[PDB]
Every structure is written in structure tokens, then in C-alpha cells.
Amino acid sequence: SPHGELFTLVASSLFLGGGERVERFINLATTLSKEDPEYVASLANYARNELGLRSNPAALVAHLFYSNALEERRDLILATTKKVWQGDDHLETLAYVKAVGWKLRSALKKAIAERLNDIPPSLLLKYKRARRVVSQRLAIRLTHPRPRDEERSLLFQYIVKGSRASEEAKKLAEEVMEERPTWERIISSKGSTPETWLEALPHLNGLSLVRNLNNLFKHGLLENLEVKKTIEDKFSRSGSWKIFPFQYYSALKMGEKEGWPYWIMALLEEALESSAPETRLEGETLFLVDVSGSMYYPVSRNSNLHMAEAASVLATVLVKRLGGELWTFADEAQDYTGHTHLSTYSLVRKIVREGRGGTYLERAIRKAILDRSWTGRRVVIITDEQTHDMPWEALKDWLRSGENRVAHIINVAGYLPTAFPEDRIAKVGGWSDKIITLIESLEVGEEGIRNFLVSNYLPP
Amino acid sequence: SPHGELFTLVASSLFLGGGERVERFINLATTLSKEDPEYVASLANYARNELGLRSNPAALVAHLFYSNALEERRDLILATTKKVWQRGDDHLETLAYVKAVGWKLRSALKKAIAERLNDIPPSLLLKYKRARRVVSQRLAIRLTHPRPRDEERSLLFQYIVKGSRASEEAKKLAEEVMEERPTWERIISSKGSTPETWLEALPHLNGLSLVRNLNNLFKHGLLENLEVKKTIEDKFSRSGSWKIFPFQYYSALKMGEKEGWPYWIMALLEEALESSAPETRLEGETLFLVDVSGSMYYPVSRNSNLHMAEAASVLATVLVKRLGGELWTFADEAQDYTGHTHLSTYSLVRKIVREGRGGTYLERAIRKAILDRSWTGRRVVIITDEQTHDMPWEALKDWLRSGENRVAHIINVAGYLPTAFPEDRIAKVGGWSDKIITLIESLEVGEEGIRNFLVSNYLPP
RNA sequence: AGGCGAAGCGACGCUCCU
RNA sequence: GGCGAAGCGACGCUCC
């Protein structure tokens, strides 16, 4: 099935970042743009906006620019171009076209010129990308965009001539990068001193302020009453943020380490309590979540958040939202459905206190599903286990023992692809902030994925 | 002056609890009940109230009833009678004193003892039966011959005098009133230790009782309920409203952080460490050289994990945050926290725990904070547990001599120094009391001339 | 000459249509 | 009869 093969080929870069993979990419992309360009458009939209990928969606757009679907379905190409170019995504399209050696199409030239002349200047300079070989300057030298107005022409002159450009272009570049500034630009221009941070507090919103609270406390701003009131009124709307629970627990762990005042700790506690990840999975769910000490592995250098804490808070908020049973397994399958009376932060702190050790998946399956004859339909397992000869066959027997029983195993180490269910077991095969939607689109299966994709992720 | 001797003898049992001191008590009490029993009344008016005691109050009343002020100044002896007999079991206290001193029980003493016995509320009477002790309510009832004007009074009297051998109606009466209008302990004993009994004890848990029963609440998972969360928050918002002492907030908060209570109650306890300020008449520029020495780190009570220097440091911290001035913490280094005032008070005392503990070097602290820097203030409060030295405060005395109205207000927690006039301008409390601030306020005027302060300030009923 | 399409190195020129 | 006092539910005694 070419559809599922293309899906699993493109999707993996959400957690993965000539050549056999490249050759398969070219052949499958060209063939499925010739036959089913609607599928490729929906797939590019999905891989751009939900899974999270930048190079591959615009690469598929460039492939769609190189077939009969350019003439027949030009509006579809506009749709996928809009849904992919979320900026410097045009830079990615030129980078792809140059690296893989295809000629610069005239229609591609006009599309790139329209993007260049319509992109807001702030994104054009913040993503100027002079150091890159495929730069904005190279894009101008290759496509020759038409300056619709004088100020755009002055930006183009600045790109093409560097500091050796006209002084008017240099001053224009200096102003529009020092106007309408974010908190980062104000901080860089005015220095790192308490008053500048006080002025930047209104501009600190969301994940930015969540990560800047450490500096706010380092400068003693958390002890001021007005900052307290602002942060409290802001935490009132903290619930509606596009922030993942792992960021919340990372900020709370940083505050614990640095000794924050307890009001901000309680605020972030109740914020972590309501970080519900959206899903269409419905019914009683049993989460055999990896909370093992080995499954702990730091997310990044700066983030003190440790991998199993992220996995556990994800599964814990999931079990709180959908009911079911949150069995934490490291060596023993600890059942926490009787501890659901606790708050979410208290639950995850109890998990980080009481969950660690080795990795024994099969014993957890037998304890929570087989021996107890679990009555549910869905078993969401998030794990980093390596490839095994005979991976999950007790689970296969369990799903064979009844009707409409499915499994979604996540291999956060990338040891499996985004593979459509074989023996009623779908595999995510990596760790992403949007693993849940990967489970959601994997549950359907390879037979009906095309219809689901065209119905759900069709670009406008 | 006999008046000051009377005061320093009376006021010491906040921290200190025949006999040579007992004999001095008898002689001084008799002499000043004959001469100036108004001083006795004014002193015993607040001797139990502020510098709380139990044995010394009603002792001056027994002496007053054994003097001619019983005849001339009957309202005066009634005033101290009322002020010393606050609780319901202090009539056994006056019986115990009258017996120990060996006096014969006069008729007017019989009438006053009957006033404190018969007119007492029944619940206090049975809660303070004290049948274990030798001088029990049974002995008092046998000695007094109380007059039951109503039937139920005679039922309680028979119940005490006969134990379980009394009439069944008296035993039944003892059983109902002990099971009506009950305290949290009685509700818990009657209904058992189940979560429901603690939920229903929560409304009756107000003030110190709730603050000390929070840990038992959490033992049953009470802190995880949202409604219990809200109720505990509402009652905690008035933690400073009641005169809960600072060491109680910090002792509850230490167990709270140790047991991992939900952070809503933890933040409220840490902000309650912004203790309701120890009410002080001392005003103006102040410099609190508080002990944070490790030896001064001995817990106020055995159950409370909080150590004594926690109470002392929180007292000094709220005092400096209310009255201004300079907070110098000394164990080894003289830390001036007046630059770290911007931290929350819990942050203040927590960094006091971090930077405190160790030895005791008072001389270097007073040199750095007072003399060398020429502290412009007039009040230097040193809560300390330091032992007696050959020359404990002479730099301080020289500092007082260097200016006008310059005074010292040492407070030694050991209880080894008297409530005394500032000699060479150094007033000493000489005991760890939960109301040390009012003792040092009374010491500001000073024991030798303290009589005018007493008569002007403390009015007896 | 204008629009369209494409080839290559600022949009000129070239093919088709007008 | 009321008060005071002494001794042990209060009588009795002093004074009124």
C-alpha cells in the first residue's frame, strides 16, 4: 500500500528531526502526486500542523509542483503551500530544489516571488539566514523578486549588499528590528536588569514566561506584590495555554531546586493539574506507563525535566481525563486508580517518588491485562524498549480473545516507524509532543487511512 | 523597695513553673497586704493574665484574705480573686495553698472558696475533677460543705464524692453532660477515629486546635478534599487573628513540609510565619540581636520539631518588620537582615536557619552592630540564652552612658534572672515566656520603681 | 507592442494568442 | 429571727 508507506516515510521526522530513504521519497512522492494528489496534500497538511515537521511537508509541496497535478490541481498546490509555509519555509523549498537538483520551475518562481514579496519584514529578517548557503540573498539572486514598494526594495538591497549597502537600507534594517520588540529584543537592547524585566513582564506570555520565571526569581521580582498580582491574573488564564505538561513539571522542578515562593509553586501546580491533551480516543483505557528509572532520560540540556516524568504526567493526565487505570510499571505494576482522588501534581510527585527501576513490560501486561482479565478496549503503552523477537503476544492473545480490542505501542526511542496496525497493534515509534494524535491517526489502520486523511486533514 | 521584690517574686512562674523562697513569699505577701494591698491587687490582676502563672495567683489572694484588707478593702480582694480564678480548677489551687501554708480556713475564705466551687460551670468542674491528686474535688467538697441551691448541683457533688458508687442518676448526669457540647477530643473518643469524625471535627477545629490537628487531618487524607481545602484556607486566613504564638505556626509548618502537605496549606503556613506581631509598647528605632546559636536550638516543646531559636528568631523578625530597625542575627557572624527585608518572612526565617546555628559570640555582635557603627537607635533587644559572665554587658553599658535615654533589654531564656529594674540601665526578663515582650515592657520602667507603672497600667476588677 | 508558455543566464528577449 | 466567731446538712454561742 503506497499510501501508508508514504505516511510512515514522511511522518517520522517529527521525532527524528542519493540514499535509500531519499530515493523512496522521490519515487513515492512523484507516483502519488501523479495518482492521488489529494492524499499527498492532506498528508503534507497533517505532517506540518499536527505531527510537526518543516522540511518534509514543503518537500512534498515541491514534489507536487513537479507533476501533472500542477496543471490539474493548482488550487490544491496553493492549499498545501499555505498549510505548509507556516517565515523561512520558502527558504526550505529553494533549499530542497537546489540540494536535490531539480530545475527552478517558472510557476515555482512566481510562487516564491509572491511569498517573498508578501511575507512580513520581521519574519524576513528574523529568518534572514545569511549564514546558510540557501539564504534570502540566494533566493533573490535565483528568482529576482519584484519590489512592490520602496521599503521592500531597500530590504532587498540590504540582503544583497550586506553592510556595504546604502545607508538608508542599513538604517531601515536597524529600525524595523528595534521596533515592535518581543521580550527577548527588549532584554537584549536594554540589558538584564530588574526594571527591564519588570517592563518585559507584560510581554512575557505563555511558554516564554514559564521559562523566564527562573530569571524573574533570580532578580527577586517574585517577591514584589505587583508582580505577584500580574502573575496570578495571568495564571488564571494559564489553563487555556498551548503548553504541554512536561514544560509545567520542568518549571516546577526548577522552582523546587531554586527555592521559589510557594504561591508560584501552587499556581504552577494547579496549572499542571489542568494540562489536558486533546484526543478522540474514547472508552475505558489502561495505561501501562513507563515510569522506570532507565526510562528517565533528560529531555534537553537546559530542561531539568527528565524523560519518564514527561511520559508519566502525559499518561496521568490522560487517565484523569478518560478514566481507566493508570498502571505505572518499572518492575512492578502499581495500580493508581485508587489514588485518583489526589491532585495531578501530587499524583505525579508520588509517581516520581515511588516509580523507578528496571524495565519489565511483559510482567506488567500479565498483571494488568491478562491475569486480571482487563475489561477495556484500549491499552496505551509508552515505552523505549528495543526491538524484540516476540514483542507483545500476550497482548495479541488478549485482543484476539474478544472484539474491538486494539493496542497503540509507542517506542519513544525511534525503534519502530509510524506503522499501521498489524495484528491490531499500531506503533508510533518515537517521542513527540503530539504522540497522542499519532495514536489517533494510527488506530484507523492501513486499509482506511486514505479516507480518514482526506476527510480530516484536507488543506483548504 | 518591697513592691519590686513582690513583683519579681510573683512574675517568674511563666518560665519557672517549706523553702526559703516560700518563706520570703509569705513575709513579703503579708507585709504588702497590710501596707499596700492595692499593689497586690494590681499585680495579681495581670500576674496570671500576661506573665501567666498558676501557683502564684490566688496565693496573694489567700494572703489578702489573711489580713485586715479583708475588712477594709473587700472589693479590692475580690478583684484579685476574680483575676486569679480564671479557670475552673483554681479553687483546688487555693485549698492547696491554704493547706500547705498551714493556715486555718477563715469564714470569708470559706465564702470565696464556695464562690469558686459552687458557681463554677459543671463542665469545667468535671473536666477538672482531678481525683488522682491528693487535694481533689472530693477533699474540697468535704472541707467546704457547699450549699446546693438546686438538685443537679447536689447530683454532681454526690458523683464526685462517691465515684462510681454514687446514685445511678448522678452517674447518668455525669455521662450526659460529658457527651453534650463536647470538644474535639471528646467527639473523637465517643465516635471513634474514622474519616467522618474528623470531617465533623473540622468545623469545631478552630485556632490552635486546628493548627495542631492538621497533621492528624492529613493522616486520613483530609487535605486532598477540595471543600476541606477551602475551609482550612478560610480558617488559616485568620491565623494571625487569633493569638497563636509564632512557634506554633512554625512547628505546624515544619511538619507540613516534612509530610508533603498540598501547597495551598503550606503557603498559608509560610505566610502565617508573618506572625501576628508580638504586641509591644516599645516603639522607635530598634536593633534586635537575636540568638540563632545551635545550643539555643532546643525545641520549645518535645512534640514540636521546631526548635526554640525558631520561636526567638520569628519573634525578632516580626518585631523588626513591624517596628523597623535592624535585625542582627548572631550565632557566630553578625548578619544584618535589614537589607534582606524584601524576602517574605518565611524566607527570612528559613535563611536564618541556613545562615544561623553554631556558637555564641555576643560581644563581637554588639561591637559590630552598636558601638563601632554608632547605632543611632535607643532600643537594643537581645533575646539570648547566654550564661552568666563576669562582665556580660559593659560595652552595652558604655553605649548607654554615651547618650541619653539609652536602655538595654536583655532577655535570658534560662529562667535564671529576675524580672528586675535595669541596673546600670540594663533591664532583664530572665526567662523564656510566650509573652516575653510584655515582660520586657514592664522591665522598661523597672522593678525598683515598678509600683507606679503597675498602679497606672493594670486596673484590678 | 500587451497577455500567455517555455529555455537559459534584470525582467529583457523568444514562441503562441490578442 | 439576722450578723460575727469557734469547732465539726448545719445546730448551738456572742451581738443586734
CATH of the domain at A352: 3.40.50.410
Q: Which protein residue's Cα is closest to nucleotide D10 at C1'?
A: B145
Chain A CB contacts of B342 below 8 Å: 220, 223
Instruction: Quickly give A78 CA vs C18 C1' distance in Å.
Output: 29
Q: Given B266, B267, B342, which is nearest A223 (Cβ)?
A: B342
* Contact in structure between B6 and B416 (CB atoms under 8 Å): no
Cα of A343 to nearest chain B Cα, Å: 7
Q: Is A368 helix (H, G, I), strand (E, B) or coil?
A: helix
- Whether residue B262 lies within 8 A of chain A, CB to CB, comes out as yes
Does one domain contain both A64 and A167?
yes
CA gap B57, A419 in Å, rounded:
87
Does one domain contain both A168 and A252?
no
- Whether residue B266 lies within 8 A of chain A, CB to CB, comes out as yes
- Minimum-distance nucleotide, CA of B110 to C1': D5
Chain B CB contacts of A339 below 8 Å: none
A103 Cβ contacts chain C strand, under 7 Å:
yes
Does one domain contain both B191 and B330?
no
CA gap B344, A372 in Å, rounded:
52
Has residue B323 been placed in a domain?
yes
Residue A406 DSSP label: E
Pairing mode of beta strands A425-427, A419-422: antiparallel
Calculate the CA B135 to chain-centre distance: 25
Does one domain contain both B170 and B223?
no
Does one domain contain both A195 and A266?
yes
Sign of CA dihedral B166, B168, B169, B175: positive
Question: Are the beta carbons of A262 and B262 separated by less than 8 Å?
Answer: no
Pairing mode of beta strands B407-408, B379-381: parallel
- Whether residue B342 lies within 8 A of chain A, CB to CB, comes out as yes
CA gap A254, A457 in Å, rounded:
38
Structural domain boundaries enclosing A38: 2-178
Chain B CB contacts of A269 below 8 Å: 263
- Minimum-distance nucleotide, CA of B143 to C1': D8
Question: Are the beta carbons of B263 and A265 separated by less than 8 Å?
Answer: yes
**Smallest CA–CA distance from A343 into chain B, residue:** B224
Residue A47 DSSP label: I
Chain B CB contacts of A346 below 8 Å: 224, 262
Residue at which a domain ends, from A248, A273, A298: A273
Chain B CB contacts of A225 below 8 Å: none
Sign of CA dihedral B442, B444, B450, B456: negative
- Minimum-distance nucleotide, CA of B70 to C1': D4
Question: Are the beta carbons of B267 and A265 separated by less than 8 Å?
Answer: yes
A82 Cβ contacts chain C strand, under 7 Å:
no
CA gap A264, B270 in Å, rounded:
13
Instruction: Quickly give A30 CA vs C8 C1' distance in Å.
Output: 25
Q: Is A434 helix (H, G, I), strand (E, B) or coil?
A: coil
CA gap A414, A428 in Å, rounded:
8
Has residue A173 been placed in a domain?
yes
Q: Given A220, A262, A343, which is nearest B267 (Cβ)?
A: A262
Cα of A342 to nearest chain B Cα, Å: 6
Residues 6+ apart with CB under 8 A from A364: A288, A327, A329, A333
Does one domain contain both A422 and A319?
yes
Q: What was the elucidation method?
A: cryo-EM
What distance separates the 2 farthest-apart alpha carbons in chain B? 77
CA gap B258, A275 in Å, rounded:
28
Q: Given B262, B270, B342, which is nearest A346 (Cβ)?
A: B262
Return the residue in B226, B229, B263, B266 with the most chain A beta carbons within 10 A, the one to mutate for interface testing. B263
Q: Which protein residue's Cα is closest to nucleotide C9 at C1'?
A: A142
Question: Are the beta carbons of B263 and A266 separated by less than 8 Å?
Answer: yes
Q: Given A220, A269, A341, which is nearest B263 (Cβ)?
A: A269
CA gap B199, B228 in Å, rounded:
8
A146 Cβ contacts chain C strand, under 7 Å:
yes
Question: Are the beta carbons of B267 and A269 separated by less than 8 Å?
Answer: no
- Cα A188 to Cα A176, A177, A191, B240: the distances in Å are 15, 12, 5, 44
Chain A CB contacts of B224 below 8 Å: 341-343, 346
In the block, which residue shows the cell 530588574?
Answer: A194
Has residue B278 been placed in a domain?
no
CA gap B373, A136 in Å, rounded:
66
CA gap B311, B432 in Å, rounded:
10
* Contact in structure between A415 and A12 (CB atoms under 8 Å): no
Instruction: Quickly give B318 CA vs C15 C1' distance in Å.
Output: 93
Does one domain contain both A45 and A173?
yes
Has residue A15 been placed in a domain?
yes
Does one domain contain both A30 and A167?
yes
Q: Report the candidate in B182, B121, B127 with the shortest Cα–Cα distance to residue B152.
A: B121
Residues 6+ apart with CB under 8 A from B328: B287, B288, B289, B290, B334, B335, B336, B337, B365, B368, B369
Residue at which a domain ends, from B177, B212, B238: B177
CA gap B366, B351 in Å, rounded:
21
Has residue B115 been placed in a domain?
yes
Q: Given A223, A341, A343, which is nearest B262 (Cβ)?
A: A343
How many structural domains is chain A composed of? 3
Has residue A72 been placed in a domain?
yes
Residues 6+ apart with CB under 8 A from B70: B64, B77, B106, B108
Chain A CB contacts of B264 below 8 Å: 266
Residue at which a domain ends, from B177, B202, B235: B177
Does one domain contain both B173 and B217?
no
DSSP for A208-233, written as a single string: HHHHHHHHHHHTTGGGSHHHHHHHHH
- Whether residue B344 lies within 8 A of chain A, CB to CB, comes out as yes
**CB neighbours (10 Å) of residue A149?**
8
- Look up residue A98 and give its amino acid: K
Q: Cell triple for residue B281?
A: 509598647
Has residue B281 been placed in a domain?
no
Does one domain contain both B403 and B435?
yes
Does one domain contain both A289 and A255?
no
* Contact in structure between A409 and A419 (CB atoms under 8 Å): no
CA atoms within 13 A on the CB side of B251: 23
- Whether residue B353 lies within 8 A of chain A, CB to CB, comes out as no
CA atoms within 13 A on the CB side of A100: 19
- Whether residue B68 lies within 8 A of chain A, CB to CB, comes out as no
CB-based burial, B106-135: b 16+ in 10 Å, e otherwise:
eeebeebbeebbbebebeebbebbbeeeeb
- Whether residue B177 lies within 8 A of chain A, CB to CB, comes out as no
- Look up residue B75 and give its amino acid: D
> Which nucleotides in chain D lie less than 7 Å from some protein C-beta?
4-10
Does one domain contain both A215 and A160?
no
Q: Given A262, A263, A341, which is nearest B224 (Cβ)?
A: A341
Sign of CA dihedral B26, B32, B34, B38: negative
Cα of A303 to nearest chain B Cα, Å: 23
A107 Cβ contacts chain C strand, under 7 Å:
yes
Torsion of CA B157, B159, B165, B169, to 10 degrees: 110
* Contact in structure between A424 and A436 (CB atoms under 8 Å): no
Has residue B280 been placed in a domain?
no
